[PDB]
């Protein structure tokens, strides 16, 4: 099966380095602090702003992202924050405590997130994290999933649709070719990862539909959180 080309290895170095530079902690498990309906919902929305900022930081370290006009950059980032933040929490599922880790510091339970306004989406993120255990995603695989979600040509209002689709096709080969090389001991690993991308895409849309729901004065919500929905 085809393995990464010389230029695909450079793209993997680049996107991996971007991810590791903008991922909270990375110890995240040992700096972890466990937590003991607009009052859990403050103390969450409050902790989003740094997580949104870390995503912006990932995108800005990707030279392909920086070649786009900022109208398209805003659009891309508005469509992939919750996806990336959801993946970043789901890869930090602890099977034993049954927690996800936010900002590499706060362990939350399924209940805490549903109580903090995520609603059904928290069930989706936990379920994903549970299923991502057997996948054993490394930092390169996570970074490439992130770049694939960022370079979504389907996002509304974009100008450079075909340029974005080309960037996304570069990541999808590099990622598949890396997958072929990592030789994961799961059957049809590529097809199943592609289904996970879709799980994340569904998380980004459901969250962005519960927003339109809570309109609960908008100024109780952090400024960045409102610009991304």
């Amino acid at each position: 099966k085809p393995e990464p080309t010389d230029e695909e290895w450079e793209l993997i170095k680049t996107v991996t380095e971007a991810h590791v530079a903008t991922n909270a902690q990375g110890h995240w498990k040992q700096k972890r602090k466990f937590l003991p309906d607009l009052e859990a919902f403050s103390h969450f929305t409050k902790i989003i702003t740094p997580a949104i900022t870390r995503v912006v930081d990932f995108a800005k370290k990707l030279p392909m992202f920086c070649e786009l006009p900022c109208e398209d950059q805003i659009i891309l980032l508005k469509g992939c924050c919750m996806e990336i933040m959801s993946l970043r929490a789901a890869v930090r599922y602890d099977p034993e405590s049954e927690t996800l880790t936010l900002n590499g510091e706060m362990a939350v339970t399924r209940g805490q997130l549903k109580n903090g306004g995520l609603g059904v989406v928290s069930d989706a993120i936990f379920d994903l994290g549970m299923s991502l255990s057997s996948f054993n995603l490394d930092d390169t695989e996570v970074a490439l999933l992130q770049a694939v979600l960022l370079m979504s040509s389907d996002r509304p209002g974009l100008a450079c649709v075909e340029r974005i689709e080309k960037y996304q096709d570069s990541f999808l080969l590099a990622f598949e070719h890396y997958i072929n090389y990592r030789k994961h001991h799961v059957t049809h690993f590529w097809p199943k990862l592609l289904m996970k991308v879709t799980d994340l895409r569904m998380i980004g849309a459901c969250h962005a539909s519960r927003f339109l729901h809570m309109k609960c004065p908008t100024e109780l919500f952090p400024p960045l959180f409102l610009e991304v929905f």
């Binding site: 900022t53 912006v56 800005k60 900022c70 950059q73 805003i74 980032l77 508005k78 400024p223 960045l224 610009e227 991304v228």
Partner: peptide
Amino acid sequence: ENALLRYLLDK
């Protein structure tokens, strides 16, 4: 309209 997100996008 998206003014903080724009401020962070530009350095």
